[PDB]
């Protein structure tokens, strides 16, 4: 580099550029031009009483909103020159906290001085960690109601307890209004953690929801949801997804007066009929004597518990032996395994990705090149500006068709968060996620068992398929969700552009949602082959040199002739091939590369391609608050 003064000039130039980027990023939030800074308050312990924390944190000017159960306000202070919108959510109530944690810019956790948190706080915190953490801050409540000799030890015990989830984070006190002002100063000046899924879509938190029914007997009508645009520029032609009730097109946007400016009616756009995106979930267009034989004719309540125990023994059997299936002797093996074939190698042997497709694949969409399309769409998001409403503007959305029940939920206390999608995000295809199993639950999960998916601002029920997470073209089906592996879950769902946080829940009992798997979204394609393996075992009971007579793998003579081409392998490392059947029963001669032990077992691998089951429905039951048994 040389020339000390020129090196210092280069360092000054880099300092100036990085500082300009930093100031450009920081000014967009909680200011005169940007949207309000949204904070979500989660009291992790049941001993923590949320209302006095909110009242102490309440006092600039306060504008209190009111809902059915939850009570949130909006704070406005020119001393910090900063605008806040505070909300509160109870842990365990996964619907509310998980559904408006994806819109808040900062999560404020409240902590018990004595214990770290509850089990419900841990459950909510696991869901928050896997769903995507915004900027977070830790605060504590009951420290100043204790003597000093217990106070110092209590803070040390808290510091020991928090390190297991939050390694090195400072704890702030909420005891005095001066501490509250210090905490608002801390929240106003943070390094912001940015979630990519929020930043690529155009999301909005509904501040006020109005409804005008088209026909009260039809129970549908126009919704007027008003709030601040926070993500990208909000364009009318894109569809709008309301997170609990599905995706549908919107009619009009107007910009009324921003009611609460930092320092103190006209319609913006209607949707053209041609430029609007269409509501298209799937593809629209669909001489023998009398007594002689053939041998000589050629010469001429507790039932659920029993199901749980058999599931346990099936999971235990499928862990000791990967895909071992006993052949039925009542029906023929070539009929029961009619759709199965043998692969010489799982890696190199070809398989046509379009060989035998179900009728469900005639109802989904594919991508000619998903990577290039994703990059192109993201470039028109970032590098190109649309004619919509800019971020931070208080607008009102007139959306066309929505049931009345949504409005009822907005009067219950449940928040409404609506985000406008990317192009090609309503159409359904085969989603592939990579997930790993949460240590909290150990219930066995079958491959095609119904689960609840939180996949990038969407919630839906589906029956997946679990596969090896491998870089090859074929992937072996996993008949169970294992605790330690990273697996691929395959579903039918509307397509999402990665990255996206993915949660898998199981409806346990009494309306309770139990988190079973956490992960993210891998590439979307229906050409990802999932291969189910069936392993058939036989006992070599007459052993000679390099060839043996093996039984119990088959029970007919022509089953041996049907599965003759498939190469056999061995638990002790031998590789062989069927030579001849001898008996009318399933006895066969098999050649091998070496000599077999008496304690040995021959086995054959059969393969089929399996597709997921179309059990998609966007409706998800509202959870009851979580508790431990």
């Amino acid at each position: 580099e040389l020339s000390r003064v020129d090196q210092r000039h280069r360092a000054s130039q880099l300092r100036k550029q990085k500082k300009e980027a930093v100031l450009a990023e920081k000014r967009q939030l909680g200011g005169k031009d940007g949207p309000p800074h949204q904070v979500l308050v989660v009291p992790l312990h049941s001993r923590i009483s949320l209302p006095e924390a909110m009242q102490l944190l309440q006092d600039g000017t306060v504008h209190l909103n009111e809902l059915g159960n939850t009570q949130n306000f909006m704070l406005l202070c020119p001393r910090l020159k900063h605008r806040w919108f505070f909300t509160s959510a109870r842990p365990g109530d996964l619907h509310v906290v998980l559904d408006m944690a994806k819109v808040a810019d900062t999560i404020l956790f409240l902590l018990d001085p004595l214990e770290g948190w509850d089990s419900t706080g841990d459950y909510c915190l696991s869901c928050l960690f896997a769903q995507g953490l915004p900027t977070y801050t830790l605060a504590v409540q009951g420290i100043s109601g204790l003597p000093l000799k217990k106070q110092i030890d209590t803070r040390k015990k808290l510091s020991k307890a928090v390190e297991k989830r939050f390694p090195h984070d400072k704890l702030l006190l909420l005891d005095t209004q001066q501490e509250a002002g210090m905490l608002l100063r801390q929240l106003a000046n943070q390094k912001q953690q940015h979630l990519a899924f929020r930043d690529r879509r155009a999301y909005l938190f509904a501040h006020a929801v109005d409804f005008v029914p088209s026909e009260e007997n039809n129970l549908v009508g126009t919704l007027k949801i008003s709030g601040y645009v926070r993500g990208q520029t909000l364009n009318v032609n894109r569809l709008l997804h309301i997170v609990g009730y599905g995706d549908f097109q919107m009619k009009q946007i107007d910009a009324p007066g921003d009611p609460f400016p930092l320092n103190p009616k006209v319609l913006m756009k209607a949707d053209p009929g041609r430029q609007e995106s269409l509501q298209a979930e799937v593809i629209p267009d669909p001489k023998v004597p009398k007594g002689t034989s053939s041998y000589q004719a050629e010469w001429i309540d507790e039932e659920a518990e029993a199901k749980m125990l058999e599931k346990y023994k099936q999971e235990r059997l499928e862990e000791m032996f990967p895909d071992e299936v006993d052949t039925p002797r009542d029906v023929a093996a070539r009929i029961r395994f009619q759709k199965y074939r043998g692969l010489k190698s799982f890696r190199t042997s070809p398989w046509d990705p379009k060989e035998n497709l179900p009728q469900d694949y005639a109802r989904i969409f594919q991508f000619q090149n998903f990577t290039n399309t994703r990059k192109s769409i993201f470039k028109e998001v970032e590098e190109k500006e649309v004619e919509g409403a800019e971020v931070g503007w208080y607008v009102t959305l007139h959306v066309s068709e929505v049931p009345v029940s949504v409005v009822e939920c907005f009067r219950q206390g449940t928040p409404l968060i609506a985000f406008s999608l990317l192009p090609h995000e309503q159409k359904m295809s085969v989603l592939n996620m990579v997930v790993r199993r949460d240590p909290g639950n150990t219930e066995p999960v079958k491959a095609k068992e119904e689960l609840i998916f939180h996949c990038g601002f969407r919630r839906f029920r589906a029956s997946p398929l679990f596969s090896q997470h491998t870089a090859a073209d074929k992937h072996k089906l996993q008949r169970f969700l294992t605790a330690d592996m990273a697996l691929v879950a395959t579903v039918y769902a509307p397509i999402t552009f990665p990255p996206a946080s993915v949660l898998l829940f199981k409806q346990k009992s009494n309306g309770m949602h139990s988190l079973i798997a956490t992960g993210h979204l891998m590439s979307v394609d229906p050409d990802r082959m999932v291969i189910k393996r069936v392993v058939l075992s036989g006992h070599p009971f007459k052993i000679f040199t390099k060839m043996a007579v093996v039984r119990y793998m088959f029970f007919n003579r022509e089953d041996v002739l049907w599965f003759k081409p498939v190469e056999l392998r061995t638990k002790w490392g031998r590789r062989g091939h069927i030579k001849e059947p001898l008996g009318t029963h399933g006895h066969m001669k098999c050649s091998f590369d070496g000599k077999l032990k008496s304690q040995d077992t021959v086995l054959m691998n059969l393969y089929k391609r399996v597709f997921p089951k179309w059990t998609y429905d966007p409706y998800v039951p509202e959870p009851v608050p979580w508790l431990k048994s």
Binding site: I283, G342, N356, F365, Q366, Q368, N372, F563
Partner: peptide, 18 residues
């Protein structure tokens, strides 16, 4: 009639062009 099949090419999903 052992490990032989026809397996015709049918009902492909509609692909989105780039």
């Amino acid at each position: 009639s052992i490990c032989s099949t026809y397996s015709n090419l049918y009902n492909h999903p509609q692909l989105i062009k780039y």
